[PDB]
Design a protein around this ligand. Structure first.
Ligand code: L1B
Length: 329
C-alpha cells in the first residue's frame, strides 16, 4: 500500500487518512520522529484560531467511535499539542486499522496556524509513544498483510507528485542504485550513528562520531546550536532568529556538505540546501539547515529531515532495525 503526499513549500509533506464512520478526512504528516496519532478535535475551543483553520474530528458523527478520554500532551521541537485519547477506524492507503489516537483540544496559533496539514501520524516505535499507545504501523503489521515489515519515504522537490510513502516495501520507481543500510543505535528510535560531518574538504564536525535522527516529520537537517554555529561560520552564513541566511548571490558558491553514515558519504550541494529564490545580492536566502537542540534521552543529536530525504529515498526497516538510503529518483 502506498500513500500520495502533497509537498507544501518544500517544508511540509502530508497525505490523507480517513477516521471514523463515515470517514472524516484529514491531512497528516507521516512522522518517523514521533509515535502517536492525532488530529484536531471538534472539542477544541474556537479561541484556538488553529482549530478554526483545520479539519476537526467530531466523535459524535462517527458510529465506530470508542471513547477513552485519557489526557495526553505531545511535545515536538517546534510546538506542543494537548488533548485526549479516542479510538476509531483509520484508513491509510486502502488499509483499514482500528487505532487509538489523540483528539487535540489545545493547538497553539504559533506554529499551527502555519501548518498546511491538520494532524500527525507517528511512524516511530511504541517505546516512544506517549501514553504507551500502540503505534499505527504496529497495528497494521499485526494484520499480517504487508509483504514486508518496512515502510519507505520519497519526498519530491517542489514543482508545478509531492511525495510518496510506501507501507510494506519500496517503490523502485523513485530511487536508483541499491540501498545502503545502517543499523539503529537501538530499536525504539529511528536514530543511527553518524561517523562525521564535513563542509567542503575538511571533516571539521562530528569527529569521534555523533547521533543522527532520521526524521520524516522534520523540515530541515538540524544540529546542536554549537555544531551549527561552526558549520554556518564555515559557510559564512549570518544567523537570524529562526534561521541562517546568505546573500542570495552567494548561494550557488556555497560548498558541499557531507554526512558520513554507515561507511558511505551522503553529499548535499548548495542547490540541495539553500532556498535559492533569487540571485540578487540585495536579498537574503535562507538555508534548509537549522540549529535545533534536541534534549535527552534522544538528544543531543543531529536530525536528518526533508532536506536530506529529498535527495535520498529512505526505507525504514522494522524487521531488521535498520535504515536504508538510496539515490532518490
Ligand atoms: C509532524 C510533527 C512534527 N514531528 C517532528 N518529528 N518534529 C516536528 N517539529 C513536528 C512539527 C510540529 C509542528 C509543525 C508546524 C508547522 C510545520 N512543521 C514542519 C512539518 C514537516 O513536514 C515534513 C511542523 C512540524
Amino acid at each position: 500500500s502506498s500513500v500520495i503526499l502533497t509537498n507544501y513549500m518544500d517544508t511540509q509533506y502530508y497525505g490523507e487518512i480517513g477516521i471514523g464512520t463515515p470517514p472524516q478526512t484529514f491531512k497528516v504528516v507521516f512522522d518517523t520522529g514521533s509515535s502517536n496519532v492525532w488530529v484536531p478535535s471538534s472539542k477544541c475551543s474556537r479561541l484556538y484560531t488553529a482549530c478554526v483553520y483545520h479539519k476537526l474530528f467530531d466523535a459524535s458523527d462517527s458510529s465506530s467511535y470508542k471513547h477513552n478520554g485519557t489526557e495526553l500532551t505531545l511535545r515536538y521541537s517546534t510546538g506542543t499539542v494537548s488533548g485526549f485519547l479516542s479510538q476509531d477506524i483509520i484508513t491509510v492507503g486502502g488499509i483499514t486499522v482500528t487505532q487509538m489516537f489523540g483528539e487535540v483540544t489545545e493547538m497553539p496559533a504559533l506554529p499551527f496556524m502555519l501548518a498546511e496539514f491538520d494532524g500527525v501520524v507517528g511512524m516511530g516505535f511504541i517505546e516512544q509513544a506517549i501514553g504507551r499507545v500502540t503505534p499505527i504501523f504496529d497495528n497494521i503489521i499485526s494484520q499480517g498483510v504487508l509483504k514486508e515489515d518496512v515502510f519507505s519515504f520519497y519526498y519530491n522537490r517542489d514543482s508545478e507528485l509531492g511525495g510518496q510513502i510506501v507501507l510494506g516495501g519500496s517503490d523502485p520507481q523513485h530511487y536508483e542504485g541499491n540501498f545502503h543500510y545502517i543499523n539503529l543505535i537501538k530499536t525504539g528510535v529511528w536514530q543511527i550513528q553518524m561517523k562525521g560531518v564535513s563542509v567542503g574538504s575538511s571533516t571539521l564536525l562530528c569527529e569521534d562520531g555523533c547521533l543522527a535522527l532520521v526524521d520524516t516529520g522534520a523540515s530541515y537537517i538540524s544540529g546542536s546550536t554549537s555544531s551549527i554555529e561552526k558549520l554556518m561560520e564555515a559557510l559564512g552564513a549570518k544567523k537570524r532568529l529562526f534561521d541562517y541566511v546568505v546573500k542570495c548571490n552567494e548561494g550557488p558558491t556555497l560548498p558541499d556538505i557531507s554526512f558520513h553514515l554507515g561507511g558511505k558519504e551522503y553529499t548535499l550541494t548548495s542547490a540541495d540546501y539553500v532556498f535559492q529564490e533569487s540571485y540578487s545580492s540585495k536579498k537574503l536566502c535562507t538555508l534548509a539547515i537549522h540549529a535545533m537542540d534536541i534534549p535527552p534521552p534522544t538528544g543531543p543529536t543531529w536530525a536528518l529531515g526533508a532536506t536530506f530525504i529529498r535527495k535520498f529515498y529512505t526505507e525504514f526497516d522494522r524487521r531488521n532495525n535498520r535504515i536504508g538510503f538510496a539515490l532518490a529518483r
